[PDB]
Design a protein around this ligand. Structure first.
Ligand SMILES: *[C@@H]1O[C@H](CO[C@@H]2O[C@@H](C)[C@@H](O)[C@@H](O)[C@@H]2O)[C@@H](O[C@@H]2O[C@H](CO)[C@@H](O[C@@H]3O[C@H](CO)[C@@H](O)[C@H](O[C@@H]4O[C@H](CO)[C@@H](O)[C@H](O)[C@@H]4O)[C@@H]3O)[C@H](O)[C@H]2NC(C)=O)[C@H](O)[C@H]1NC(C)=O
Ligand SMILES: *[C@@H]1O[C@H](CO[C@@H]2O[C@@H](C)[C@@H](O)[C@@H](O)[C@@H]2O)[C@@H](O[C@@H]2O[C@H](CO)[C@@H](O[C@@H]3O[C@H](CO)[C@@H](O)[C@H](O[C@@H]4O[C@H](CO)[C@@H](O)[C@H](O)[C@@H]4O)[C@@H]3O)[C@H](O)[C@H]2NC(C)=O)[C@H](O)[C@H]1NC(C)=O
Ligand SMILES: *[C@@H]1O[C@H](CO)[C@@H](O[C@@H]2O[C@H](CO)[C@@H](O[C@@H]3O[C@H](CO)[C@@H](O)[C@H](O)[C@@H]3O)[C@H](O)[C@H]2NC(C)=O)[C@H](O)[C@H]1NC(C)=O
Ligand SMILES: *[C@@H]1O[C@H](CO)[C@@H](O[C@@H]2O[C@H](CO)[C@@H](O[C@@H]3O[C@H](CO)[C@@H](O)[C@H](O)[C@@H]3O)[C@H](O)[C@H]2NC(C)=O)[C@H](O)[C@H]1NC(C)=O
Lengths: 235, 283, 267, 114, 68, 235, 68, 151, 60, 68, 70
């Protein structure tokens, strides 16, 4: 009956293949699903939830609480960066672990605008203005307020509304960027400077710390799944 | 209606401003994250966004079939002084790091396990011998059923035990399994004990390990070499690949940070250090 | 209109009433709010008892002191309460108990102090023990600290005693006790009490579990874990100390199959 | 088929500037095509200085470290690295990687005893 | 009892229909009586990230001040 | 003709598989079925028929008639159990063989309410009130009428209507319970005590026996078939 | 002469139709002329356990007294 | 150590297909990769070998390239892989336009890193014509069975 | 609260109907009818003591 | 969801239809959900070589003089 | 088939007669090996041949048979 012909690619198993296969337990009455609070329909949903960036990764402060507290002081106004960061929501050790940056390793191409949210964690009295800035790639990274200022910045203010968010608009030469430290698909440069200085009244803690959070925006998306370098199975 | 293969909300245009509207300013205490669109902190053009999340969907994340375990079994000569090797693996994904971290992002899960078997085989000893194409039996022994004693015993009669007879060298065997959970989602993380200790009893009589639920949730796989003791001893390995098909996940838990240790979330010292070095002021 | 500004609330579950004034507009776990078991997804066949007001009200557990060397605290809800009035007595009397919650973490300072307490409500919070030999061997008596709760630590210390061990959890803080980074922990329903602003955090947690209604004496559900994100500082003073104090309220709870009283070896 | 050559242990001065020699002697007559010569540490996927056959060097700390041999489009082999100013903690065991084609990813582990 | 559905072709030349117009379909047929044996239909949906991003006992307007 | 492709899982035999296969005897005129009295359409039907529980399993009384007769006496009222039983209609040696408990081994998950029926087998004169009781798991098993009383009980009466039935309502944390002595999926505890005492007039047998029967209710159901431990084939 | 029937899906996500609505079917085709060769159609029934549970020369009302 | 070859996906290895593609400046195609696997007994020794099965794991640009023959990298939880049994219809896997851009550029004029004055001649250099470090990807192919007396 | 605009804090005002040991610890008083008040902008609170009694009026 | 199309037969004897009249068709069925897996439909088009042969900031009439 | 005292790697001991018998070694999450059992008060009939089982992974179910001569 019916003359058929086995085609190049027969008897071939393909891990990510999708073909119907005989059922081991025929008839097994499956248990009805309840309505568990908190479903998730797509990974990029998780990508839109802020996760604190471990900004400091100094041999001493790494792998320990001190790693997320970016300390600011009441030092006389300077023009040097109080944090840097290579926009590589996958590559840069600073982002490589945050939910966003942790999901980004299970992929080969990320895209869309990101949103860094900074929380001033210090004495209700302390005030000041911090300039959070981004400058697309291909130019000397910014090391002075004078140079960073020229790029895309949001001159934030430490007040009642305790937090800010500088959206990093998706400005890139390709439709997606390599989720590996590739030179052609470079990310850009993020960097917060003091626009004034954190001024405090007498009898106040002179060294308050800021915590940074990061997340994707309803634009972001990833593609071509892979195995995260993050966890190894020794032997 | 909003499926996974749509197309992200197209970027709307936007000029200067000076409004008392304050999009940029948040306040993380509320726990809510400002849904600020690029269109807010800068003047954006009108981009007609084609990209879609069609690949990151919960279904596609787990679209590839991961290797849950390897199983060594071997058919030795009749004259072998040792008993014939038939491996027996207890169904439980928790044996290899890979699929175990993916599942672990979520607190609960309801999936249809679709088990495939890539069986291989070589002649152990230096001896130059031959062997007629072996056939393997992969018997599913349901939680509580009798686990096989000798290689060739009655347990293998399999009158009611879903089993597969794979002939060596052929399209790798595959059997789909529906949600065989006692509950309404396999709990990737069980907080609490399987037996509460009670004062009117000995510290032993009523104790138990933390995190352990059912003695045999998923089940056990008995795999023999079906043929008889052949002069040329041939060892084989049956790599089982589990691919969760019709799947659902609940409560997005943060991914495993330090190397896995045992069936329980517990963690060995040393491996305790995960991050890398970087100067707080160097790009 | 009027001062109905997000900053002031007035929780009243049961016969107790909280009325905070720096209140950061509360969180509702996953949009889903606490409710009773719809017949459509019920499981056990008897008549479910419902303490209602008898239990539903707010129970203040005991306060925790908060210094500079403070490394965090953790409660196991289903259990955390076990004493607190009738929700304590009903707790034990039944084989099955489905209960929702409303945790209000109270803690206020002056405009001159500083610090941020991330109050994370982790569902199925399986904290890791401390025996590099055997895994999960953590003892019950020890695994359920109740009204007192446990506390996160600086760096891991392996339990060596083996003639007989100390069988406790050794929950490291940067790994949220369950071997997973704190900086990424902001994924669970949570609120950061940031001393400058709000002086409390309110999370309403609806019963979450793989089962319709499950045990209590045994299986735990939600677990609160408060960690100091921004360490506390006050004036060039040796060390300052503010006292964090939570008050939980079991909401829409119901329990099935009455028996004789359960009396666990908690000692 | 070659192997990852390296002085196993290499100490390790305080505040000096030592060179972590890590070369790769191949089987001349038999050839391979190196792709990237990059370091790390060990218990840290985060890679330090990496030199790609094309993108060139990739210093994780542009200053305190440098590839005393890696020179663009040439032929990756002697990948020994040299970092300036040591540091009480700079001390440890590293992983010398060689994503080569078609030889597989080669890797050797150096105790850096300061 | 054919299950014909539309593929999401990237308007590729001579693929059947694109920038010359036309659509692309694919036949499917569940063959086994037991549902847990059907091919993962990949026609999955997407909810709003709100139950995780925006979860509050009130409502949040973005242009408004966070902590009112 | 017709280009086909052999898919992962070909040439694979699966015991419980259901595929059409060539007929060995083509055309064989099958013999018409008659209407035999007593058909059965589903195993759980048998599960709803009472089968006497062999309550006593003492080395002396086991495997012999005496094993089903649970003797009661005219002893002065006591507060101790005149029988126990771990609700494990599969595991507990006391139930492991009854039709219900015998069918329960050919499965991995049982569910639904059970119904224990007790028959007073003794002198028409003897009277008395026996308290049959059940207490869901997770609490000290009941050893005194005072403790068992608190649970789910039916204070039965030895009269004209010679038998009773205490339905054990399906009260459980999971949708089905392991048909093996698993701790997580524990059954509960059944136990009959004297609510008064069996009182008899003069010239009456002072030691009458009660027989217990057990069966499922139109709610019970089982799933995921296996091989019963009950019968072994030695060599 | 297709034999299309409905499977009893447990409303699983992206299985074709569930808690978003829809049904799931599967095609069957008897191929051999001899009936005893068809695939066990598993669409079996269920009678009332009465011919075994409740078999009496009368009728039994549960709320009533057994031995009248 | 046991030999497992690893080839970096890139047509540019043989003259034929490379000249055809090269007539055009840019291209958008769906790569449909097929594998004709063969095999003989190396040594003079007269030995036997039970039908080998090969694993052809696609290791996406940036993923970890396999260290030993039998290491964790091969667990392949998320790496599109094929298990070819020797002697059977030659394996085939279709791949859609996996380009970062809108056409694979058969000819890229310009560098992947611009040199900048405030940096060392090295720190910022690069080879002409090179674009992405790993465009198409890499193929890991092992012998899945264990060390057998007859090589 | 009659004190410095800076001073803050939370005081638990509580009531517990008769017939039980008077409450001497927050742990025991907490169980009854309480209003966990807060020292803020709105300088005063009021804990209504609901008329919970066995008779229609009580002896003065 | 059959994709029946006409082949371009060279009117060969007894091929189904030619110089005796008739047409020749062939059934196709996309089987995989992923488009990049469909058989290269070979029903490709052909543009005018003008964007390469005749590309000028004006128009060129052949009978006319080139360099006007 | 009715099994007497059983000790599960997790659920702990499982005495079929909580009193007259006990596992003189089996101590939760440790590592099952020395499973020797010890029962109190013998009994004219306690006498016989038993079956020592070891559902191990991946070694198969091991079983030895002891004449208990009282
Ligand atoms: C770098 O690596 C070297 C070499 O060791 C190898 O790499 C390591 C990173 C590690 O992976 C190891 O497994 C591998 O072999 C390290 O030097 C070794 O360190 C180990 C562990 O600290 C040493 O183990 C001890 O060996 C000495 C003598 O050989 C014993 O006296 C000693 O005694 C026992 O120790 C074990 C646990 O180690 C205890 O259980 C016993 O109770 C008892 O105390 C250890 O056995 C080993 O000796 C070292 N090997 C060599 C060749 O020096 C080195 O520590 C790493 N560098 C740094 C900076 O950490
Ligand atoms: C426990 O087991 C021991 C050991 O025997 C082994 O296990 C048994 C349970 C059983 O399975 C047996 O098959 C196996 O080998 C028992 O001790 C053995 O018991 C058997 C049977 O009772 C004995 O058979 C007798 O052997 C003696 C001498 O060896 C002969 O003199 C005797 O004579 C013949 O018996 C056969 C039937 O047995 C008759 O057909 C003949 O007519 C003739 O009478 C038997 O052959 C055997 O000897 C014992 N073996 C040992 C090593 O002691 C033991 O009884 C079991 N314990 C208990 C408490 O029952
Ligand atoms: C790999 O390359 C490195 C550097 O490119 C080599 O290391 C160093 O090589 C230089 C040049 O030969 C050596 O310097 C020479 O020796 C004296 C004193 O040792 C030095 O003062 C002079 O500069 C002189 O030119 C240097 O000794 C050597 N250092 C080390 C630690 O070896 C290395 O030799 C190369 N590796 C191989 C295997 O070839
Ligand atoms: C398996 O464990 C059991 C008990 O845990 C061991 O049996 C008993 O082990 C104890 C402790 O060594 C022995 O007791 C010692 O000997 C004297 C007299 O024999 C006793 O009075 C003291 O208590 C002393 O500590 C005991 O002899 C021994 N009993 C038997 C029957 O062996 C057993 O040794 C362990 N098995 C193995 C193989 O290790």
């Amino acid at each position: 009956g019916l003359p058929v012909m086995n085609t190049p690619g027969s008897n071939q198993y393909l891990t990510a293949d999708n073909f119907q296969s005989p059922c081991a337990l025929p008839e097994f009455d499956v248990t009805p699903p309840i309505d568990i609070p908190g479903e998730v329909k797509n990974m990029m949903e998780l990508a839109e939830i802020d996760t604190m960036i471990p900004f400091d990764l100094s041999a001493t402060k790494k792998n320990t609480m001190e790693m997320y507290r970016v300390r600011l002081s009441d030092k006389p106004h300077t023009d040097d960066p109080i944090l840097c960061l290579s926009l590589s929501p996958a590559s840069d050790p600073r982002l490589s672990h945050t939910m966003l940056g942790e999901i980004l390793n299970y992929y080969t191409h990320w895209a869309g605008s990101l949103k860094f949210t900074f929380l001033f964690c210090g004495s209700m009295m302390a005030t000041g203005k911090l300039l959070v800035s981004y400058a697309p790639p291909g130019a000397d990274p910014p090391k002075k307020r004078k140079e960073a200022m020229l790029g895309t910045h949001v001159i934030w203010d430490i007040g009642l509304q305790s937090s800010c968010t500088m959206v990093v608009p998706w400005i890139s030469n390709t439709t997606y960027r390599q989720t590996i430290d590739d030179s052609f698909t470079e990310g850009g440069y993020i960097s917060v400077f003091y626009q004034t200085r954190i001024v405090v009244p007498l009898s106040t803690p002179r060294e308050m710390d800021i915590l940074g959070f990061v997340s994707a925006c309803n634009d972001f998306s990833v593609r071509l799944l892979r195995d995260t370098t993050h966890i190894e199975q020794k032997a | 209606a909003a499926t996974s293969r749509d197309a992200l909300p197209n970027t709307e245009a936007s000029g200067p401003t000076h409004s008392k509207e304050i999009p940029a300013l948040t306040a993380v205490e509320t726990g809510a994250t400002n849904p600020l669109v690029p269109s807010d902190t800068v003047q954006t053009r009108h981009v007609v966004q084609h990209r879609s999340r069609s690949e990151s969907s919960i279904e596609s994340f787990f679209a590839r079939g991961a290797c849950v375990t390897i199983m060594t079994v071997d058919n030795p000569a009749s004259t072998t002084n040792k008993d014939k090797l038939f491996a027996v693996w207890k169904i439980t994904y928790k044996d290899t790091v890979q699929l175990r971290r993916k599942l672990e992002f979520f607190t609960y899960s309801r999936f249809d396990m679709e088990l495939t078997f890539v069986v291989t085989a070589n002649f152990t000893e230096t001896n130059n011998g031959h062997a007629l194409n072996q056939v393997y039996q992969i018997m599913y022994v349901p939680p509580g059923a009798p686990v096989p004693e000798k290689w060739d015993d009655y347990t293998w009669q399999t009158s009611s035990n879903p089993s597969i007879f794979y002939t060596y060298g052929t399209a790798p065997a595959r059997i789909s399994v529906p949600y065989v959970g006692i509950s309404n989602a396999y709990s990737h993380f069980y907080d609490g004990f399987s037996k509460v200790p009670l004062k009117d009893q000995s510290a032993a009589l009523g104790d138990s390990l933390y995190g352990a639920a059912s003695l045999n949730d998923f089940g056990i796989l008995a795999v023999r070499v079906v043929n008889d003791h052949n002069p040329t001893k041939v060892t084989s390995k049956i790599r089982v690949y589990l691919k969760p098909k019709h799947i659902r996940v609940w409560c997005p838990r943060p991914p495993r940070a330090v190397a896995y240790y045992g069936p329980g979330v517990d963690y060995k010292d040393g491996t305790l250090t995960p991050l890398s070095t970087k100067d707080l002021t160097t790009y | 209109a009027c001062g109905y500004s997000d900053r002031v609330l007035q929780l009243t579950l049961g016969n107790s009433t909280i009325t905070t004034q720096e209140a950061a507009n509360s969180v509702v776990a996953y949009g889903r709010w606490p409710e009773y078991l719809r017949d459509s997804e019920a499981n056990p066949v008897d008549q479910p008892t419902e303490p209602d007001v008898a239990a539903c009200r707010f129970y203040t557990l005991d306060t925790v002191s908060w210094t500079k060397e403070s490394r965090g605290w953790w409660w196991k809800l289903p259990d955390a309460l076990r004493d607190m009035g009738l929700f304590g007595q009903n707790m034990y009397y039944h084989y099955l108990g489905r209960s929702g919650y409303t945790v209000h973490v109270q803690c206020n300072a002056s405009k001159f102090h500083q610090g941020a307490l991330g109050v994370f409500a982790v569902p199925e919070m399986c904290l890791a023990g401390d025996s590099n030999t055997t895994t999960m061997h953590t003892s019950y008596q020890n695994a359920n600290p109740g009204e007192k709760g446990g506390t996160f630590t600086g760096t891991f210390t392996p339990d060596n005693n083996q003639t007989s061990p100390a069988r406790r959890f050794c929950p490291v803080d940067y790994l949220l006790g369950n071997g997973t980074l704190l900086g990424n922990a902001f994924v669970f329903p949570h609120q950061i009490i940031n001393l400058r602003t709000n002086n409390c955090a309110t999370l309403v947690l609806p019963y979450v579990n793989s089962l319709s209604i499950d045990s209590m004496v045994k299986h735990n559900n939600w677990g609160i874990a408060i960690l100091p994100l921004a360490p506390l500082n006050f004036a060039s003073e040796s060390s300052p100390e503010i006292p964090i104090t939570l008050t939980i309220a079991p909401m829409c709870c119901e329990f099935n199959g009455l028996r004789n009283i359960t009396l666990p070896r908690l000692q | 088929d070659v192997v990852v050559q390296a002085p196993t242990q290499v100490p390790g001065f305080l505040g000096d500037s030592v060179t972590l020699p890590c070369y790769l002697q191949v089987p001349n007559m038999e050839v391979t095509h190196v792709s990237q010569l990059t370091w790390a540490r060990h218990g840290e996927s985060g890679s330090m200085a990496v030199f790609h056959q094309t993108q060139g060097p990739s210093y994780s700390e542009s200053k305190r470290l440098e590839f005393v041999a890696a020179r663009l489009g040439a032929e990756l082999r002697n990948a020994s690295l040299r970092m300036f100013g040591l540091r009480v903690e700079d001390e440890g065991n590293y992983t010398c990687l060689f994503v080569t084609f078609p030889q597989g990813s080669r890797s050797v582990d150096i105790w850096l005893r300061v | 009892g054919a299950q014909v559905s539309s593929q999401k072709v990237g308007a590729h030349e001579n693929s059947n229909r694109a920038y010359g117009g036309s659509t692309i379909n694919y036949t499917t047929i569940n063959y086994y009586r037991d549902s847990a044996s059907n091919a993962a239909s990949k026609q999955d949906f997407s909810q709003d990230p709100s139950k995780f991003t925006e979860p509050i006992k009130d409502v949040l307007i973005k242009t408004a001040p966070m902590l009112n």
